[PDB]
């Protein structure tokens, strides 16, 4: 009894809402949240990248903050061929986004005891010398410690904090020194070479769009890549120079701002408005600002993305319990299953895939997490507030988006067939989030790709010519959208499904919706 | 600034909405409530019968508790011929229906000192015998009043309270006789002929279809009346003789039980079951239940009826103070208002237009205040509770029906056009309360004249030819509409209309919903 | 600008509320979420067992899955000598419980080896034999494991899964022997001495209260301890063996029972009827059941809890990443602050101030999340659901707890000062969740103790003598309340506060609201 937490969503209040969620209660099939895999050692193997994708990864993330141009093109490569490895059978292909995330402007440091893999060791009280001085720059140990960051001198005081190494090791500046700062261990640990370094309160004067950056994005291009992760974007001119950056050639280029500071959170509307997504980039804001009061920020991020119907993505440690463990821990199933119920389009794993020992355990998890949560999200609530909540408006297209979505309701749908070029009109149906997936079926396969980034929409692509009968290529593309629904077990013969289309072709004219019942 | 009250709609408290009601805020031109006029003496005349059309009349409501066969349907026969006056432009057109208002089950006097219009004279403490001799039907008089209901000193007990003539006269019964009963005047007044006669408390025995009934309801059939108004509906038993006595051939009648009485609204549930609409009959529920608990039974009444989706009027002495002069009094006018903002489908006019001084003046003051209240609906809150209070639902005309109303409240739309031959497609529309008019376009002519009953629904008659192309006959209808929007106000060239089709001929296959731009 | 979430707390929808969340308004001082730590070797030692209380500590969980009563007296011996080094003045004095929590029926397996922590291996696809043969019970390899549950092989069938170790190691029912079982590892991992047993989907028939529980729990008794928690409680009758066990001596001492498995959740409405408080027991719960839907049965608990009125502990890894390091993981910060939104009244540590390495670290962490979240909280809504989900009520302190949260919401006071002897009259302050600190002022010790398992209650023991003038007595704790209250910068001088009295001595007499400004 109870089929996708349906006795909890049809109730008056919250606090009964909650009260009626059932484990007993099996979640439908379907899964609306987007899942990006940050892809490493760990998962660059054609062969094991066939499984990522089978186990749920959507959009792979190639961390640019390290490797060369020759090695990511190689992951690149390899994404791409297991990913086609599925093409001969569009009803079965599940599209795959590339998406490269800048290194942007980060402090690490240089090289311990001159080896590779060699690791000092700080102690509580310990004095350390920072040194800008070139000559260590790969020969860091106990009392020398070198920074990329030069000017650091300059934007630092006497009495500050630096952090090293995901603010693992804490240090206090004693003496500003000419080149160098003196300062003293608050909290040890082993420090291993090239390691991040934050600077909390501090004006940081480094380029939003570095060179090295210039240099990816422009390598992002030639490489095809969907989107784009901007890191420690600060305000709305770090976005724009980045959107220049990408210029005409990659105008179609999805630019995801990265929060990573406490700048960006102040300067949240001005960024969010000049992006096409947000990333809620937990780890290095977990360092910029108290840990107590990320969550904070990340709910307050997707909440204003959730009004302002634009992607958002909670990334960073997720499930690290399971970098080394085949099981997550409580914790981390449970920060899961909030950041759908927070309401964010993506959830994301970085360490987890790129060099842990169960990748694929640790995306299957997140298919299996997100799509619980999903069922026990309070539509009822949900819908009403959004619709209220969204601005008065005259397109068509709106107005056909949101009837789809309330017609969903009223039937229990299987799901939200949607006919699109550029995604837009699959876009609108998503930012009213209904319950039943949004199979968006396409034949511009970018904006297949680029879709995942929407919670709720299931990217299909169409590789059916077209008809000449403009009237039967469409009739064509929805039962394709039919034929996947089907196959995936969203939905049987006798089921309904709720169908958007156009008067027209070319974009911008869906304005027609029907309840068909499936072939 | 502000149109149809839009800055009080769009409020988050209804404290607020009202705060926010703008007299200088103008209502739109269309008018959602239906209006019953009752035709008469003042309003029989074809050529004054057309300005009653012209100036609001909907229905025409025939009074059967009065009149010869013989007299109804020349009163009939001018009420179809004024309205088809019109006929020579299905644009302009407007339908009207006809309501037969069974006499049932009443009591009323003989009469008065034999002379036709001879009227007595009742005293406060003064006694008055009430006589069940025939020989004094004719002879009524200070102290002899006969009644038609014989077996009345067998349910009539001493002590009881019996009231004449609209319960403006009372009388108590001080000792039961045999065929008599001495009675003792409460409150005097004068007293005519054949008057009205309740029993308050009292189960009187009478036929809920009388033998004159069934006579009038066989007529009615053969006059092809759109619906019946059956009065003093205690069960639903009741109901059901008049469906029977209907039979076959009026199958498609439509059976507005009226509620007059204690016992119909203690059966109230029952009673709209087996109906198809119901009218709150004030006027008698007046005298057979305490005046200052009506307004209960009338919320009541549109309340569930609402919620069940059943057409509900709200008749009697909405306007009396008109009956005489040509302005109504504050408290009418307010009246008016609030049964429109109660939720009532349709407001109805009796002795203001039958026998009135100012018929068209009472119409008009109608067409005014509901326009003027339907605009000071608290949408947001009802559009909300009526969707949570609606079952739920897996038939796919319902939830397209949804979606166009929500569809609309977002685009702000000028209508909601919509295809049907039974009306069941508008009927729906019209249970989710949109603030746009329903513009059912139709061939059917008697369910344009029914669809009255309908809030919102604005029933436009197609007199085209079938095209063979069943896609341009469906296009062809849907810019029959389009154009009568455009001729009657309601919508220009470039706003935007919700329309509402099928996928194939004939009932029950409605699916489809368009934001069209008006052509 | 803005203190604990103002702007928020104060918005229409929770959408909004959401998008609200400042990162730069501060919390107030006070935290309500009282917070359970598991006492262990890390934390035992009288001087760091000080440190925990000033970190945050509130109660002391003694974990009796392990060690010997004369180990845990004197556990609980230094619990109190650390607590009452604070008596020395009753205003700063910070009351502290103890929780005794059963082993219950619980499965371990034996000795490595021989060795005393010698640690084997198994490997995915190796078999190994479960032993029942108490030979082996301190020869356990990877080929013979052996096992407490003798009756197993009874229970347990051919497919089944049988966890080790937290679940980390998974093995499965290949051939059922007759004193064995021959099962292969799906998942190694090292596997060490006497590890947690779980058989998912299987009804093991071990006692409710097992011979050594009886034991403990009379020991409890003995020890004078505040609260007992139940472990694997699976039906009412369950929670009613342990009440009887503890019988009169122990009839105060409250039964927070413990869901660790299947049947627990399902019973759960029956469990907490028969209880005192609950417990979400994670760490159990998320191997009895899949990981994927433990949240939807943690916040079924703690909704359904917040629902009755009763005590309820979200617990198990909350922090896990602090065992051996100084900072939490993201997920483990999101899972604390998501456990008090969800209206969890207690918050707690295990292995993180048991064994870990920063104990103290992870108490505070706790203090500081718990802070920022419970300022988070919509009480808007929050305060609205539960007084219409609260039951009708002629008990006329209920109806004076309710005003006091009002009242004390409509002039943001600073807290709610509650005299109470049995703690009653501050529960139900507690469970209309003001987000003013609760201070319960009572002379009673054990009350003041238990008090710690509501949220919001702050605990104060008032030493004072009794006046002969009761209200002057009254007038003095009052006092008292309000000195604790300016000394622990929960108000100022000019700040007003919401007090709670009776009009005569003894318990079930509150009655009596005031707001007054502080001394
Ligand atoms: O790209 P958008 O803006 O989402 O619009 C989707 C479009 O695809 C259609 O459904 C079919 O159009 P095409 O044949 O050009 O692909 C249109 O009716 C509609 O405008
Ligand atoms: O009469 P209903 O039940 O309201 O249904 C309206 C019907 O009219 C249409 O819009 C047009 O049908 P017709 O051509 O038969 O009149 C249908 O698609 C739809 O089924
Ligand atoms: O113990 P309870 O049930 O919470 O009631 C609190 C009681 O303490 C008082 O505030 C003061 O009474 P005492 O002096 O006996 O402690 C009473 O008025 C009230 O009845
Ligand atoms: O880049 C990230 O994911 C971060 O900084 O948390
Ligand atoms: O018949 C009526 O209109 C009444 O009784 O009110
Ligand atoms: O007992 C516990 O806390 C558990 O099992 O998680
Ligand atoms: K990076
Ligand atoms: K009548
Ligand atoms: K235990
Ligand atoms: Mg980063
Ligand atoms: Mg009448
Ligand atoms: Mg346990």
Same mark, same amino acid.
């Given at each position: ?27 439908? &099939? ?18 094991? @990248?066939?499984? %990522? ?11 640019? *903050? ?9 992951? !690149? ?37 001159? #080896?590779? &893999? ?33 000017? !650091? ?39 291993? *070479? ?38 420690? !974007? ?37 960024? @969010?408005?000049? #992006? ?33 119907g634009? =992607? ?21 199933? #449970? ?5 759908? @119920? ?16 169960? =990748? ?25 507030? @959004? ?8 397109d068509?297209t709106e107005?056909?988006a ?10 229990? #749908?299987?799901?939200?067939?949607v006919?699109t070029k550029s995604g837009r009109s699959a876009h609108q149906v998503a930012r ?8 968006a079926?396409t034949?511009?396969?970018?904006t297949?790709?680029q879709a995942?980034?929407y ?45 958007? &289309?156009g008067?027209?072709?070319?974009s911008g004219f869906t304005? &027609? %919706? ?6």
């Open positions: 009894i109870q089929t996708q937490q349906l006795h909890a969503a049809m109730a008056d209040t919250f606090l009964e809402h909650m009260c009626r969620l059932d484990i007993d209660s099996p979640p439908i &099939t379907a899964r609306n949240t987007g899942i990006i895999c940050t892809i490493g050692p760990a998962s660059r193997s054609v062969e094991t @990248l066939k499984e %990522m994708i089978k186990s749920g990864m959507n959009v792979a993330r190639l961390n640019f *903050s390290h490797g060369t141009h020759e090695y990511h093109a190689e992951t !690149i490569k390899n994404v791409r061929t297991a990913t086609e490895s599925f093409a001969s059978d569009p009803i079965l292909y599940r599209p795959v986004a590339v998406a490269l995330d800048t290194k942007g402007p980060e402090i690490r440091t240089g090289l311990i005891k001159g #080896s590779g &893999t060699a690791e000092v060791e700080l102690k509580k009280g310990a004095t350390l010398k920072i040194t800008l001085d070139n000559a260590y720059m790969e020969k860091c140990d106990e009392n020398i410690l070198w920074l990329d960051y030069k000017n !650091i001198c300059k934007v630092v005081e006497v009495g500050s904090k630096i952090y090293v190494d995901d603010g693992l090791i804490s240090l206090q500046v004693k003496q500003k020194g000419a080149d160098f700062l003196v300062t003293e261990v608050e909290n040890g640990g082993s420090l291993g *070479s090239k390691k991040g370094v934050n600077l909390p309160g501090a004006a940081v004067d480094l380029p939003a769009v570095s060179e090295k950056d210039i240099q990816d994005l422009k390598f992002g291009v030639e490489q095809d890549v969907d989107m784009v992760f901007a890191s420690f !974007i600060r305000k709305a001119s770090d976005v724009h120079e980045v959107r220049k950056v990408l210029g005409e050639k990659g105008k179609n280029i999805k630019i995801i701002s990265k929060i990573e500071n406490h700048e960006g959170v102040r300067r949240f509307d001005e960024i @969010l408005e000049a #992006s096409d997504g947000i990333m809620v980039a937990r780890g290095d804001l977990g360092i910029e600002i108290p840990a107590e009061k990320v969550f904070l920020a990340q709910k307050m991020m997707i909440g204003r993305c959730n009004r302002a634009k =992607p958002v993505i909670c990334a960073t440690q997720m499930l690290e319990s399971m970098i080394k463990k085949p099981r997550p821990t409580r914790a981390e199933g #449970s920060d899961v299953a909030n950041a759908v @119920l927070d309401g964010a389009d993506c959830i994301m794993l970085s360490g987890e895939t790129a060099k842990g020992d169960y =990748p694929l355990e640790a995306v299957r998890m997140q298919n299996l997490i997100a799509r619980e949560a999903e069922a026990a999200i309070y539509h009822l609530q949900l819908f009403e507030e @959004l619709r209220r909540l969204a601005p008065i408006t005259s068509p107005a056909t949101v009837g789809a979505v309330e017609a969903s309701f009223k039937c229990c #749908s299987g799901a939200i067939i006919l009213y989030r209904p319950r039943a997936p949004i199979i079926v034949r511009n396969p970018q297949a790709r995942h980034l919670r709720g929409i299931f990217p299909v692509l169409c590789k059916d010519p077209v008809q000449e009968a403009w009237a039967e290529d469409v009739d064509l593309r929805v039962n394709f959208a039919m034929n996947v629904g089907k196959a995936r077990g969203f939905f049987k013969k006798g089921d309904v499904v709720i169908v958007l &289309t008067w027209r072709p070319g304005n &027609t %919706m029907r309840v068909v019942p499936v072939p």
